[PDB]
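Q: What does the assembled structure look like for these inputs?
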Amino acid sequence: WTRGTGLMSANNIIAEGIEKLGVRTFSQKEMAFNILGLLTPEIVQLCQEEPVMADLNGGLQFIDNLKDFTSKLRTDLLETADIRRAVSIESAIEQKV
Amino acid sequence: STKAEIKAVLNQPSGKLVEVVGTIYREGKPVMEVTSQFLYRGEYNDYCNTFQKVTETPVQVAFKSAKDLAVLRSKEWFHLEKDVQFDVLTFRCESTYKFKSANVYSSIKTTGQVLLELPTKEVIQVGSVDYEAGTSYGNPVTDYLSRNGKTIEESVIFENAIPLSSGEEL
Amino acid sequence: VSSTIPSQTIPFLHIQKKTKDGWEYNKKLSSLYLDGLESAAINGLTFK
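A:
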């Protein structure tokens, strides 16, 4: 899970939720750092002998039903934020009335 | 028998608008409402002796969500007097205005009643509400109930007009 | 980091090794990656 600007700015709002399970999300600099750590002289020499899987996933493999978990986290955040906006809007309407 | 009761004494640019809605009792049970308006044509500025105690209709709001509970809680005037989930209202309310000028109200008094559906179409007693204000340009309760939607309206207007008994024989 | 990785705990960034059951977390190889990451943090990476 990488947090960057662009077309993934809509999925960043749940990154805090997943992270409080003991999983961690990465920023773009952190994943730059992790993948540049695959170019160290020891990993480089270790690739000439064995193809290298580098699971840089921050523990998202241990979450059962990641799709449903993320969907319900996003639904909870959206259904809190919209009702908070609407109660404020209705209170503003009442105060203007 | 007869029973009169003054409802509103307004100060409009046309003059005092006396509102008398004196009802009619046939041994206790009301028979007819009978509302009448009189208008003291002229211009009157006495606003201390000016009021309008209007009773509201069974106004139904429009909602479909769980934010409805949060909105109803947010309303400080509403007081919890039932233990069933909220999705819609049909309040039969009643308020009391006091004018200090042409349009602004010196105070607002609202007590009303609360309504919503019950179990298996088996409805029983309900509770009420409360509200005060001061130097206000509108009533939050009534305007809220209306703004969400129109009342219990057993009147939808037909599409196009045709005559009924039109002519010189009317 | 070799002395820092907790027991029975898989680090977030780990190199996997392929055995009969498939790719699985391999402690020494992941620790070799993470020590290179220390070297990249305290000293940095050479790319000439």
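The two ends of chain C are 26 Å apart (CA to CA).
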